[PDB]
Amino acid sequence: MKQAILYVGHGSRVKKAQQEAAAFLEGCKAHISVPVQEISFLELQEPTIETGFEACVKQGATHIAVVPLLLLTAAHAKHDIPEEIVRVASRYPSVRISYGKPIGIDEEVVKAVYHRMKDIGVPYENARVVLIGRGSSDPDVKRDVTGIANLLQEMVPVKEVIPCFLTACGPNYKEVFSELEKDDGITTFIVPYLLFTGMLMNEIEREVQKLKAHNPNVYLSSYIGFHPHVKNAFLNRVRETAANSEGQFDFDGGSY
């Protein structure tokens, strides 16, 4: 037996984002006791999935644990990535494949949100938290962001956590913002639940400036990014996919 890890990010065309994702995945390798480890990306950035998978095979891997670097569960985890996996794996029918889950609802990621809150330096006890995800038409995305909000609610003595979204599913973060123009003395933290900055993050920044014009007790944290606790959660995913102790991550054909 020879085990491999194939990390799969979604990929970016922004050079800085490519570099950050690649460096994160590279820094994961020293934490995994597996002799063959390759990084790959679905799109816009190579190594491609095909390249990384074939590299794993060429180095003698009998088992490949494919682990997607994804915060939430949507089309990429269910369709695009598995489709590329089946396309390349069809050529090596003797190689056993396991395929992991996105990070999703994990206590470590809640800790990442908590530390982003703490970084502001404002008391958070009995404060409101507004957790902004990108959003998706896939209901699993809203469900998981809500689960993270509930876990934060259980773990930190905040007043409440409001999951909301930039697009595709409700409630939209602008509706929450419009409802927060009051200023009732309650502090509101805005946590962008995103791996990278970019257009939508810039939009959040501008909208939070507008909101602060109405309600000065509003504080925007930096986006989650590749926080150390995000790394802990992702390493959990990697280890469970490689262990595959019950076969629950077996890469079975058919539509996901």
Task: Tell which residue, 144, 119, 126, 125, has the closest CA to residue 134.
Answer: 144
Number of alpha carbons in the 13 Å side-chain half-sphere of residue 185: 0
Contacts of 247 by beta carbon, 8 Å cutoff, 6+ apart: none
DSSP assignments along 1-20, one per residue: --EEEEEEE---SSHHHHHH
Give every CB contact of residue 57 below 8 A, 6+ residues apart in sequence: 64, 92, 95
Integer Cα distance of 106 and 192 in angstroms: 17
Rg (CA), the chain: 20
DSSP annotation of 101? -
d(CA 154, CA 124): 14
10 annotated among ligand-binding-site residues: yes
Q: Is 229 annotated as a binding residue?
A: no
DSSP E strands, the chain? 3-9, 36-41, 63-69, 96-99, 128-133, 160-165, 188-192, 218-220
Which residues make up each annotated binding site?
10, 76
Which residues make up each annotated binding site for Fe cation?
10, 76
